[PDB]
Design a binder for this molecule. Structure first.
Ligand SMILES: CC(=O)N[C@H]1[C@@H](O[C@H]2[C@@H](O)[C@@H](CO)O[C@@H](O[C@H]3[C@@H](O)[C@@H](CO)O[C@H](O[C@@H]4[C@H](O)[C@@H](O)[C@H](O[C@H]5[C@H](O)[C@@H](O)[C@H](O)O[C@@H]5CO)O[C@@H]4CO)[C@@H]3O)[C@@H]2NC(C)=O)O[C@H](CO)[C@H](O)[C@@H]1O
Ligand SMILES: CC(=O)N[C@H]1[C@@H](O[C@H]2[C@@H](O)[C@@H](CO)O[C@@H](O[C@H]3[C@@H](O)[C@@H](CO)O[C@H](O[C@@H]4[C@H](O)[C@@H](O)[C@H](O)O[C@@H]4CO)[C@@H]3O)[C@@H]2NC(C)=O)O[C@H](CO)[C@H](O)[C@@H]1O
Ligand SMILES: CC(=O)N[C@H]1[C@@H](O[C@H]2[C@@H](O)[C@@H](CO)O[C@@H](O[C@H]3[C@@H](O)[C@@H](CO)O[C@H](O[C@@H]4[C@H](O)[C@@H](O)[C@H](O)O[C@@H]4CO)[C@@H]3O)[C@@H]2NC(C)=O)O[C@H](CO)[C@H](O)[C@@H]1O
Ligand SMILES: CC(=O)N[C@H]1[C@@H](O[C@H]2[C@@H](O)[C@@H](CO)O[C@@H](O[C@H]3[C@@H](O)[C@@H](CO)O[C@H](O[C@@H]4[C@H](O)[C@@H](O)[C@H](O)O[C@@H]4CO)[C@@H]3O)[C@@H]2NC(C)=O)O[C@H](CO)[C@H](O)[C@@H]1O
Ligand SMILES: CC(=O)N[C@H]1[C@@H](O[C@H]2[C@@H](O)[C@@H](CO)O[C@@H](O[C@H]3[C@@H](O)[C@@H](CO)O[C@H](O[C@@H]4[C@H](O)[C@@H](O)[C@H](O)O[C@@H]4CO)[C@@H]3O)[C@@H]2NC(C)=O)O[C@H](CO)[C@H](O)[C@@H]1O
Ligand SMILES: CC(=O)N[C@H]1[C@H]([C@H](O)[C@H](O)CO)O[C@@](O)(C(=O)O)C[C@@H]1O
Ligand SMILES: CC(=O)N[C@H]1[C@H]([C@H](O)[C@H](O)CO)O[C@@](O)(C(=O)O)C[C@@H]1O
Ligand SMILES: [Mg+2]
Ligand SMILES: [Mg+2]
Ligand SMILES: [Mg+2]
Ligand SMILES: [Mg+2]
Ligand SMILES: [Mg+2]
Lengths: 268, 259, 268, 259, 257
């Protein structure tokens, strides 16, 4: 794409969208927002995580307003994503230490719940085309379930970087977070942002405000250009683990808010 | 609201406090605390009793009476009474309980610190850890909110219109609304987490949006909201209660012409 | 006070001062810098913290040089504080893990002392008049000893904010840290800065440098104005707890350094 | 090298490269990305860390397109595969081992993240926890380094000239050299520390020095070096191995006239 | 000490300070203290020589009058790489199972450096005033109860390497007009060490007036302590582990009265 002039009163639009988490349990059922209880393999050889027990990436394509093209010009207008605000919603719910939680003083049947604790994985991506993925796994001999999208028998090389093992995030709730990450060799037309804090007893730390704005412009002053007039949102928002009295543990996820400002860009 | 020129007599300043609503009744010996937290066995038999969970604090501040509206341009906010957390002697589980020795363990665990300042009530998203929780009659909640309530459901909206009754654990700020409010929030989780608090009279936050417009005080009302969970108070017998702290606000407003 | 012009030539001065901590144990006896061993009540109603077992605020008024007043002027000169350096001194001493401390591996009588750990409370205030206080307590039914300055029988409202419960920090070593904090409704003529990190096994975190200057000027470019030609300094520097082999714990505090640059200001 | 004027497309090139980690286990086999299970010696005197049980630096030379030299002016770098650390099912010691319940504990313990970009091999200082350690034949070390190798000895020098054979625990960047290399490094210690990693394609680091000069690529060669220890993998039987991640590099060079 | 204009003219020195954690140099525990013993009370407290760290220090010789003025510095904790060692005679993560890595180096961090035109000026201050320091150590003997906090009588200067106990001396903020000092402390005995290294960080040494330290007698004074944490043996004996510090200083010629 040959990028040309920015248009400056009717040249800018705003979209707002949410992505619900895909932590593994089905929508419209009692554990929506959570994974199912996590089972652990005895070895890498026999490792087979069941469907529902691991999170997947969230994705959506947002259809943009009419650009009102110039019928006789040899150029076209494209929506250019210039800025965003993103917030993890429902942080407030993590003040719940009463709902069926392993207690601080289990031996005394006393104390609050321990609440949600452990690993936070927070990433979002805003592009003019689907997020480009690198396949990479902890254990290449893991047998993923039929419901999941992965590279089957990916080989030892998939435990680190293999340039043959590529993907694109083309479907919501089926690309396992533990098997796909953003590809830094691609995503020329996406901005991605990721933070990981590991562990299983780590205090979760989350902020929320409606006062924060991230500029989406690259080093040439060009934001994502929305090919076929779509805006591609991707995320994963693991808050940590929910622990039952019987010590079963499940992933807990939260939904993400996006506001994206776009402006009209002349191209070609 | 169409926003015209800043009027430049033109400036006012209010100070206010919101006391915390951790659950125990005001004017009684456990004011500032929740009652002792009980935990359900399962999501299906989950009814957190009244007094055992915190609620948002809120207040409408009356301001002096094309039109002029009061426009909020800056604030200072301070969590008050941080000093009281140096108390490790008041009926606290001890560091070496099995020796009946050491300090009290003092206040530890989750911090949830949020404030909002706007020209109308805080717009809220309903969201809960367990949709099947039965909240007490005293609480304001969406009843039988459905499985969708565990994540984002665009039907499940509310506005913060009463002090001490909107459970923190069931409402948060709606990012899809609040064009006329600035909100700020931090959560640190856990039950033995060290609390981290700062205080100073030297910090101003600017409340102007990208367009240089502050919150515009509809009907000459300034809306303040907070929640300041500091962590938990643990008794000798291991019973745990939320402890909260009051919040100071100073807001600077200017006359702005509109319509 | 009506505030007029700055003098910029004679017109500048610096004072340096220390405040020693008032953690509870008497001065120039063997436990100076410490509290006595902390006792814990069984309930709120029978809560009576003995004198010496809890810290108090440090404060001093510093006498300033003669201003050399213009005898015939309608106006008057005051000293205006414009900047400070402050440092917690003796941080070096906390590398001591041999001095009668509970050992890391007590069941094996082995390892270092555990050293000082637990809550940090670090605050300082620089003003032209005494620090204005808000009375607030964890437990209102606490009976403070006669040695201590408190509001007696303050009632339930004292557990949160009650606008009736005020004070000024008019004496060193007697205002319990746990019952008084800075009053954000007053202190127009004082700058105060406070940090708390809780717990009883929290690692203390402290920094020291002679390269850090804090400006004391308000939004109007006016510093604290020294009424009756006094500078008021206040602090509390709880570093954490000292734990003995028998598991007795005391507060440990450190002294604070102040450097304050003042300049002549004309006022009505 | 006398450094004259910047030549201003055809004057700018951009390379991209990955460095796979060298945690110890062989390439293209089932434990690629890990060390073998760590053994611990009884004393300094008889301390022989076996080949495969310790990490080594990753390094590559990239071949690039009055003389003209390539001058590295900026980079992006990213630790890849951070996403795999959300795996708590793969043969991991469980949170509640006694009850055979909970997630795996996942990767925890020490983080060591370092990268270097230079016009020549990274210049190294030899320094070791225990000088009496006997390294295996596969490792490049200074043999019989002496007690002074446990701190700084100006005699104990090297350059990173070989991928996967310079042990991290024996070699670090030499601050007395590396005039023509930029290095960055962070260590967080412990064995139960939570790993903290970030990733984004939006961060650029400028490689120009105080004089506006970046690494100048000798022999038309760009030198990349790293080590990315994420933490430890703990089996059900409490055996612990290093886990590493590959690092991405993007480097932007310009033609520089030199003498 | 009146300063005129900045006046061939710019020079740069590099130095290293090895750590003085207690164990004698060029012997097998160089970089470590000896195993720490703990007193039963303040009254009998007598830390043995080799069981506590001392400050490192050196004077570097440099090449109306002219003085060398220190304008900027680079400093680096060297050898952070060695802390990836979890095999060398360390208490194991799962000692009851004789399994896991070593726990490695853990506990308190104390990192301080000073760059000045004269010896670093010290304030004497001790946890316990009744501690008896050994003959080898430079201390104020019988310093009294006020030495547990600030006493203005209890001053010193860092005149010697490896003999001023870290736990007895810190920088005096009432003096050091011609030194820049920087310190960080993180306590605990199981705290994770956090260390960074780059050749890309330069600290400016100019004061508010734009004057850096002026090197009296053409001597540059370098001081540091870098306690990274503790080494714990299988038998639970614990010793300080320290690391050496790199210093790059840029000096320019300043005219003085
Ligand atoms: C992630 C996964 O699937 N892990 C499962 C696996 O663990 C093995 C792997 O982690 C390998 C990776 O190299 O490491 C094994 O541990 C060995 C290995 O580290 C070795 C050095 O390379 O040192 C020890 O083994 C010693 C010796 O070298 C071995 O040859 C010897 O092996 C004997 C067997 O133990 C006997 O059962 C057999 O009859 O005869 C051989 C002798 O020829 O054992 C020596 C120590 O006694 C390390 O232990 C990992 N193995 C183990 C036991 O953890 O496989 C195990 C089941 O073995 C689990 O399924 C694990 O989940
Ligand atoms: C939060 C709450 O109310 N929890 C209570 C609930 O726990 C059950 C739920 O958490 C569900 C969520 O899917 O999982 C149950 O555990 C199951 C499943 O994870 C299942 C896979 O879907 O795998 C295990 O069950 C298998 C098998 O599928 C079962 O049909 C079979 O009977 O048992 C197998 C295991 O041996 C796994 O156990 C949770 N059940 C238990 C137990 O925790 O319900 C329980 C009472 O049953 C408690 O009240 C919880 O508080
Ligand atoms: C800080 C302090 O001084 N605490 C001492 C006090 O503890 C009691 C308080 O913490 C109050 C605060 O409301 O709670 C008591 O626990 C009760 C309540 O939480 C109650 C519901 O409001 O629920 C429990 O009581 C139920 C039932 O509701 C009661 O009517 C019944 O008599 O007992 C039931 C037992 O399940 C809960 O226990 C605190 N009481 C105890 C006990 O902790 O008084 C105690 C000694 O009695 C100690 O002195 C505390 O230090
Ligand atoms: C790192 C290593 O290889 N450690 C192995 C070693 O441990 C010994 C070393 O740590 C040295 C370093 O100086 O200290 C020994 O501990 C001794 C000393 O600290 C000593 C004072 O210098 O104080 C203690 O010993 C005293 C006395 O001085 C001794 O002469 C007397 O025999 O015993 C006294 C106390 O009862 C202190 O114990 C370390 N020794 C031990 C033991 O830990 O050697 C041991 C086995 O000898 C292990 O192999 C270590 O892994
Ligand atoms: C740091 C050090 O050297 N500690 C050793 C020392 O411990 C004693 C000191 O900590 C002093 C400091 O004031 O306190 C003793 O504890 C006492 C006091 O806190 C006291 C009130 O001032 O309260 C307790 O004692 C009361 C009563 O006052 C006593 O008269 C009576 O004998 O016992 C009462 C309680 O039953 C409290 O115990 C420290 N004493 C002890 C013991 O910890 O001295 C001891 C030997 O006694 C050890 O050598 C310490 O390491
Ligand atoms: C990640 C993984 O492989 N999980 C597997 C688990 C665990 O191996 C065991 O629960 C440990 O005993 O075993 C199953 O039979 C189960 O519980 O459903 C099947 C599942 O494929
Ligand atoms: C804070 C507090 O109330 N402390 C009180 C302590 C503790 O309650 C007990 O030591 C617990 O057993 O008891 C006293 O008898 C004491 O030891 O002097 C009275 C003192 O006022
Ligand atoms: Mg590319
Ligand atoms: Mg909106
Ligand atoms: Mg006021
Ligand atoms: Mg050099
Ligand atoms: Mg001075």
């Amino acid at each position: 794409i040959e990028v040309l002039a920015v248009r400056t009163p009717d040249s800018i639009t705003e979209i707002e969208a949410y992505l619900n988490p895909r932590m593994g349990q089905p929508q419209n059922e009692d554990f929506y927002g959570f994974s199912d209880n996590v089972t652990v393999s005895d070895d890498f050889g026999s490792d087979a995580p069941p469907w529902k027990q691991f999170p997947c990436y969230s994705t959506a394509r947002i259809s943009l307003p009419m650009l009102n093209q110039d019928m006789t010009s040899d150029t076209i207008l494209m929506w250019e994503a210039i800025s965003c605000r993103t917030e993890v919603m429902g942080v407030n719910m993590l003040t719940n230490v009463h709902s069926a939680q392993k207690r601080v003083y289990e031996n005394d049947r006393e104390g609050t719940g321990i609440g949600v604790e452990g690993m936070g994985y927070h990433m979002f991506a805003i592009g003019g085309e689907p997020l480009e993925l690198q396949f990479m796994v902890f254990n290449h001999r893991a047998t993923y379930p039929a419901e999941a999208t992965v590279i089957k028998n990916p080989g030892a090389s998939s435990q680190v970087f293999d340039p043959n093992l590529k993907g694109t995030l083309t479907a919501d709730g089926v690309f396992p977070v533990e098997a796909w990450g953003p590809d830094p060799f691609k995503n020329e037309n996406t901005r991605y942002f990721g933070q990981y804090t590991g562990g299983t007893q780590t205090p979760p730390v989350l902020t929320f405000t409606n006062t924060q704005t991230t500029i989406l412009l690259d080093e040439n002053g060009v934001g994502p250009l929305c090919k076929g007039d779509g805006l591609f949102l991707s995320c994963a928002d693991i808050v940590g683990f929910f622990t039952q009295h019987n010590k079963k543990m499940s992933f807990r996820g939260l939904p993400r808010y996006f506001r994206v400002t776009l402006r009209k860009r002349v191209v070609k």
